Write a protein that binds this ligand. Sequence first.
Ligand SMILES: *[C@@H]1O[C@H](CO[C@@H]2O[C@@H](C)[C@@H](O)[C@@H](O)[C@@H]2O)[C@@H](O[C@@H]2O[C@H](CO)[C@@H](O[C@@H]3O[C@H](CO)[C@@H](O)[C@H](O)[C@@H]3O)[C@H](O)[C@H]2NC(C)=O)[C@H](O)[C@H]1NC(C)=O
Lengths: 211, 211, 211, 227, 227, 227, 49
Amino acid sequence: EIVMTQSPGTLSLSPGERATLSCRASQSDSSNSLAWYQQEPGQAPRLLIHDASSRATGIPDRFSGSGSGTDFTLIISRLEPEDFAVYYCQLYGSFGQGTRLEIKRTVAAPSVFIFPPSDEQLKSGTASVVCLLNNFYPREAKVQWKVDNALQSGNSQESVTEQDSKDSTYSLSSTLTLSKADYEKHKVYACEVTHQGLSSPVTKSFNRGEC
Amino acid sequence: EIVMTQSPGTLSLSPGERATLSCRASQSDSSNSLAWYQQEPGQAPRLLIHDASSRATGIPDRFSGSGSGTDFTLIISRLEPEDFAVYYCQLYGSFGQGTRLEIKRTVAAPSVFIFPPSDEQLKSGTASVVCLLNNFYPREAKVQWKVDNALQSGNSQESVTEQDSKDSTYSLSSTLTLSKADYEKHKVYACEVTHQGLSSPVTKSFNRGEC
Amino acid sequence: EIVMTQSPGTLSLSPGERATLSCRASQSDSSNSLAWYQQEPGQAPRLLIHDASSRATGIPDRFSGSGSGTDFTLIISRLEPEDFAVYYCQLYGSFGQGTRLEIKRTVAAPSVFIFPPSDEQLKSGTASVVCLLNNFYPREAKVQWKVDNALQSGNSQESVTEQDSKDSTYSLSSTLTLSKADYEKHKVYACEVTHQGLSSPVTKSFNRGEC
Amino acid sequence: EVQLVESGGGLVQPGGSLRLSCAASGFTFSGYWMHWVRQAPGKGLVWVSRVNRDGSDADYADSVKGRFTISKDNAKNTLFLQMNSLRTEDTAVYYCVREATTFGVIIMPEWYFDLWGRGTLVTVSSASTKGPSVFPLAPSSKSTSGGTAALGCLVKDYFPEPVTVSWNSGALTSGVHTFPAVLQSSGLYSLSSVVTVPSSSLGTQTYICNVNHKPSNTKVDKRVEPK
Amino acid sequence: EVQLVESGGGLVQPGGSLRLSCAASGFTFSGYWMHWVRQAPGKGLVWVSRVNRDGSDADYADSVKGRFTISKDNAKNTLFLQMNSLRTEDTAVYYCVREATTFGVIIMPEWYFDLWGRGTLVTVSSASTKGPSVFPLAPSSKSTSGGTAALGCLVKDYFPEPVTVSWNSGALTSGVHTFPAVLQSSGLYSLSSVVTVPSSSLGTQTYICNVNHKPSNTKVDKRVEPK
Amino acid sequence: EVQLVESGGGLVQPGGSLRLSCAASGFTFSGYWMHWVRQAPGKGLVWVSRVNRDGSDADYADSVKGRFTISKDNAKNTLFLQMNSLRTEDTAVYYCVREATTFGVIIMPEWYFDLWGRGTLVTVSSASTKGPSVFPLAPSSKSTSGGTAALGCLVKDYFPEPVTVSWNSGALTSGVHTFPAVLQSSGLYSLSSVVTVPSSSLGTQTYICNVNHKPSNTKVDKRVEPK
Amino acid sequence: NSNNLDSKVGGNYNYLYRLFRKSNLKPFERDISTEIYQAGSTPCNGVEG
Ligand SMILES: *[C@@H]1O[C@H](CO[C@@H]2O[C@@H](C)[C@@H](O)[C@@H](O)[C@@H]2O)[C@@H](O[C@@H]2O[C@H](CO)[C@@H](O[C@@H]3O[C@H](CO)[C@@H](O)[C@H](O)[C@@H]3O)[C@H](O)[C@H]2NC(C)=O)[C@H](O)[C@H]1NC(C)=O
């Protein structure tokens, strides 16, 4: 029944700057019965601190957080390139939603490519159109599609990819799935991407039937 | 003083699936003397459970909840066609915002009809244009007007009708009122509605002067 | 940790009729030790009440408000022309966001004028176009740019001035800065202001090259 | 059975005075505390006032502090709620509610209600009762979609309390759309009742609508033309 | 060392039954209290159930009440969790976790977990296993920008558990985008894996795509044409 | 009368050190608890620091932790605060404020502030002091609307503290739009002030604007032409 | 009640109590021993674990 809310939802720093995570016990006080965990998206979580004050075995000395009352707070002294994981709090009857720690970088202009369905896809029974944004930062963009010079929503599926470690960038593509009986009616299919870091929203038009 | 906060704000399920709701006192404990009331929109609220543990006589055994400290939860064992009501929690001095226990259905395509002002409405000095959304689900929508092919808001009103029992679908209406002198100068009036369950936002245009 | 929310954000009321201000804390009870602070934007903050019940000497007898525990309310018996100030709330460790108390007056039609850059700004290598909205109430308006008859945002900055005392109205400005080469490519620049009190949005256009 | 009947209410100009009565039958009035609960139109519930077994103390809410007075006339078996300087935002429906008591060695209330009487709607505004303006709503050519259609009536400048409307003397429903009325500027209520009936039915049967006005007894009936 | 190995799980139709086992090695299993926890794909992990030392008293969560039974045998040195009438909302990966006990005069578990085992994936859906559909995604003229480009493949209607992809027998990476699959209608997992390789390189070396489908052992290799 | 004079502050390079003084006249600077408060330009105020009567213990917020050190000099009658590695967001105005004490049988502070001295502006940026550039703003034909029109001046590349400007040696006011200076990229401030006067009057009297530059004493006067 | 002077935001300066003393303590005496104490059988008091 207990809810364990974590703030902020997503926090971004340079690979050296330290930060803190403020997680509020929603009902009453835990009386220090709390734990922390760090889970990279590729494997199991590991314990970091128990009883909200003491630390476990094998953890780096940088992890040292204390909290009492509703406001339970975690301090890290300094940052290393391993923070790309999810921090989960541990009250005895609940779990935190999770906070993502991000490596900061300069704003990057996305690169958009539109791929129409192939001929094999043109005989299967359903057409799919894909729009891929490559080498984009930060993780916030809006993708809107224009079919027959008219916007539409509620039919395309968007997927995001985790940020790389070699260059700290991610890619995001969306695919639209539609039957053939509706694909041939329209002519122009365009992809528009809106980003706060772009001078103007980037539009790319595509003509059906290739050339 | 004390403020009741209800979670979740709205909650829709199948006619048989059970549900749970939780209220939150802002601070402190009040000896677990909390009450729940279910109010059908047409009738007065009815007490369900008092002292947060014991259910009042005559209420079906299905309603059975318990809570303590900051949080008080009521859980319903099952569901039947009587949950179309608002559940307000009541401590000593305040009522909760309430939660509308909705009935779930499949996505329905709205139907939009635009009705112009007739001659008798025209001679009165003001022109009102109405838009009628019908048999649409679920409860979230946004209707806008294109006056002289240009979007404008802040001058129209919207009303939504409560869910009907026999088919579990409703209607919405929206009236835009302008003076006669303003109504004459523009030419094209268009009506659109946005729905997550629609492949494309249906746009229905109108021409003044009839025939 | 502790966050105070003063609700609402803007309190526009006529000079004659009274006003009230409510502040919402976050957690716990601090033995009812709270204070209000009135801040004329050019002047320094000053205390109004202490311990949330008693009023400091010299403060007018009009200023008197009280609360206990959860929510703290401060009532103003009558209103005089000095409430042009932001009212903050100082708890044990933090200050609230504050609230701003405005004066009511009728709806105003804004006056829009666009000043293009001169030759001196033209030679500097970058050029700014300025849109000024004069004598408009309330404090709710939005402006945009039609560069080459296409909406564009994210490249401009907006500024708002404080309320005037002689006429109770203000001016708002928007400055759009572009490079000279980008400026020459487009041909038409148009300014539009959106206001709930306007019968129709006012469009004013500008053609390059002057006359 | 036990029930509470509320009396009074109606339209009163702002700053006026009104008194509400709550008669209780089916149980002993003397031993129960009583409260009043407001319900704004299409909004949540808020607690108003509280009265003892005899009326010695009161628990007036901050919203109604200094303007609302509650009285408990136990001898003549009634509850009273009288107010002064009533303001516009107080437009709501009032519920006379009871406080449960153990009636043991010590009465010991528990701050939870048991039964709710039928509420009484109260209105304050600067407008006055006026006759509604009713006009037909029948789709003409190139406006109706398909064989099925929807024909109705729209009312205007109707300040009196919500109006009821019917079609063909209530001989058919065809999926009625209540469309609860809404307030516009200058204190007016607008209602637009439309019944979904196919357009290819006019000519063989008359199509009339009656807007029964109960406050001012302004019974109005009108016909609908296919244009 | 000390670890927990999960056994069971896989494809199960809704409303069925399943059993999960957690074999324990490296520590005294009898004295330690045990928990079962779950994690939905891409969502925060949620605690599921508790058990005592003997395995006589259990604390199943509300979402899993009535349909989950957990047992803790001491001699067999394993933990058992049996599921009945599964719902589609419970597709996740299950972990079994220890609970730290002081082991002093009183056992006194402290409600915090020490070690996490290698859990198992459980999926509940009405669909059945079927081979994925594949087709190359090679940019043509006026769709590739600059000398550098990106080339890949998209799989379709692959209901078995997420598939591994590779290129040129895994002899090059060049920044492989894993791009995990996304759920669509009728329960199909589809992912579009693309590697950023300049378009002006195909013609001297062959580009082969390998969809390593281990569930049904339907290994497919595919050719990409420049069009 | 009771007042605190704030001394020090001004331009400082990022990563540098700054140091403030607060001399107290009109009351006893011995027992009262002391506080330091900041206020960002065009933002709300937050608490900075606290020091007790003796000065052994000090209270700092997280943002100011490890950089700010407060000290109360009772004998020298001054409140002191030393900063190092001043970050860019620290650019704000600083107030020295007091904390009330009953001075009863125990001092017993209350944590409410009594009097606020006029604060000092501290600005830290990577740019340097430069002289402003002015240019006339006079609407020509087809740009002035109706009779009334607006003529003014806009300053540019003016990093230093806010500037003052008057028109025609203060002979006409005719409405003043101060338009407070705003920060752009590269750490720069710009202000554009306008006075509105009709258009069929330029030619018999001149229109000029003078900008008075206090920091570097670069007083500039510029004439405005009708173009 | 000294809460307005001792208490500060973000934790306070450490104020300690002892968990255990071996013998009954004779009147008007105190222990200030900060040595690491051990509860289990395994040796400590010089070893941190
Ligand atoms: C806590 O401390 C207060 C204040 O202490 C005062 O200020 C300090 C900075 C030092 O200079 C102290 O020496 C100084 O007293 C103590 O309160 C003080 O109590 C005394 C005894 O009652 C007061 O003196 C009397 O006060 C009034 C006139 O003001 C008459 O009854 C007598 O003529 C006599 O002067 C003294 O004024 C008062 N201090 C203040 C500032 O009002 C206090 O005793 C101490 N608390 C405890 C529990 O010891």
